[PDB]
């Protein structure tokens, strides 16, 4: 049957894509042909596939334990790996180490879904960053499945990614290359899965998203991701995403810009007693505080470039630091109205009484306050 040879690092990388993205369902399928080696893993929600160059001494197919194949290739020294299917066993040899693994019948393995037509392409680093930015805001409760997604809206060369759990809403807009300028799309993708794909290290320069084209967008029920000989499909969520754009204020009664690193550290510091952190903004300074006399109190004053009348507002400290870490900028702008209404966080890189117009950014993190005791 199948017999091949390739370098361990290459082998581990291909198996790695399939492992990071995923009885008979415990197997991965190895296929050898003129196009080298393909590794396929099937799951009913997500399928993944990786193709690499290899010496195909003899072509064929074999089905082996995915978990075991991953553990082995990860542990193997960085040397050539030889794989020989002899009977219902697979011999794997690398240096002086020899493995003999049981197989399963290949005809039992379910067919992997076909990817939809390509919809567009963006750089892989941008894809990775944008998904990790918005994924932090998704709900993780399956009784509210409409929150467990990342919304992908495609309007020509513009992509808008959004996620919310009813308390924070994260939105990232970016430019990419579409299959056509009038391509239109809104789909909802499971956040955990998509976040996983984005950080699984596809490698190379490109990420291609496949949802179909024209009226057949989303019709397959699948998001395809591909690039660098790798590809995967993910089942789309059926739920509707909330209308979020009208929640974006056009002006603010007060605006605060601060240093991101030092606010995050102060929050971690003061939250050591609490829940909620409270923020008392005034011209030039903000007092960040937490706790109660029964368990202990903490507070710290921070420098702030502040426009507007003093405002006292409170936040879930975890949601607040999530937002600050999603900015990827040295400074943050807070856009406020009242203490019971969303705060708008925007990345900032290093006049009168108001109201103050919102400054447009390609990223926003909208955060609902919590009520003061």
């Amino acid at each position: 049957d199948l017999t091949f040879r390739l370098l361990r690092e290459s082998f581990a990388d291909a198996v790695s894509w399939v492992a990071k993205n995923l009885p008979v369902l415990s197997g991965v399928l190895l296929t050898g042909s003129d196009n080298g080696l393909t590794i396929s893993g099937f799951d009913y929600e997500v399928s993944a596939e990786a193709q690499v160059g290899a010496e195909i001494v003899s072509p064929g197919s074999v089905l082996v334990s995915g978990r075991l194949l991953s553990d082995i290739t990860r542990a193997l020294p960085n040397k050539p790996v030889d794989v020989h299917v002899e009977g219902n066993r697979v011999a794997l040899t690398c240096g002086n180490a020899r493995f003999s693994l049981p197989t399963m019948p290949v005809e039992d393995y379910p067919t992997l879904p076909t990817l939809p037509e390509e919809t567009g392409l963006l750089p892989a680093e941008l894809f990775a960053e944008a998904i990790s930015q918005v994924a932090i805001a998704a709900g993780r409760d399956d009784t509210l499945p409409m929150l467990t997604g990342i919304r992908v809206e495609i309007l020509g060369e513009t992509v808008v990614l959004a996620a919310t759990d009813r308390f924070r809403l994260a939105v990232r807009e970016l430019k990419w290359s579409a299959s056509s300028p009038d391509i239109e799309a809104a789909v909802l993708v499971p956040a955990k899965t998509l976040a996983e794909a984005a950080k699984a290290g596809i490698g190379g320069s490109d990420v291609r998203l496949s949802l179909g084209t024209g009226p057949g967008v989303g019709k397959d029920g699948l998001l395809g991701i591909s690039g660098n000989g790798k590809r995967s499909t993910t089942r789309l969520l059926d739920a509707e995403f909330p209308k979020f754009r009208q929640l974006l204020p056009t002006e603010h009664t007060a605006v605060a810009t601060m240093d991101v690193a030092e606010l995050i550290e102060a929050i971690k510091l003061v939250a050591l007693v609490a829940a909620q952190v409270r923020m008392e903004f005034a011209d030039g300074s903000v007092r960040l505080s937490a706790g109660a006399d029964d368990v202990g109190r903490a507070e710290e004053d921070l420098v702030v470039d502040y426009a507007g009348e003093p405002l006292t507002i409170a936040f879930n400290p975890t949601y607040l630091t999530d937002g600050l870490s999603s900015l990827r900028s040295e400074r943050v702008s807070f856009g406020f109205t009242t203490a019971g209404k969303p705060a708008l966080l925007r990345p900032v890189s290093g006049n009168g009484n108001g109201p103050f117009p919102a400054v447009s950014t390609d990223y926003v993190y909208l955060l609902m306050p919590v009520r003061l005791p």
């Binding site: 919310t164 009813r166 308390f167």
Partner: peptide, 10 residues
């Protein structure tokens, strides 16, 4: 702990 004023949603 109010939600965001998502309509519908909250």
């Amino acid at each position: 702990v109010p939600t965001l004023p998502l309509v519908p949603x909250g």
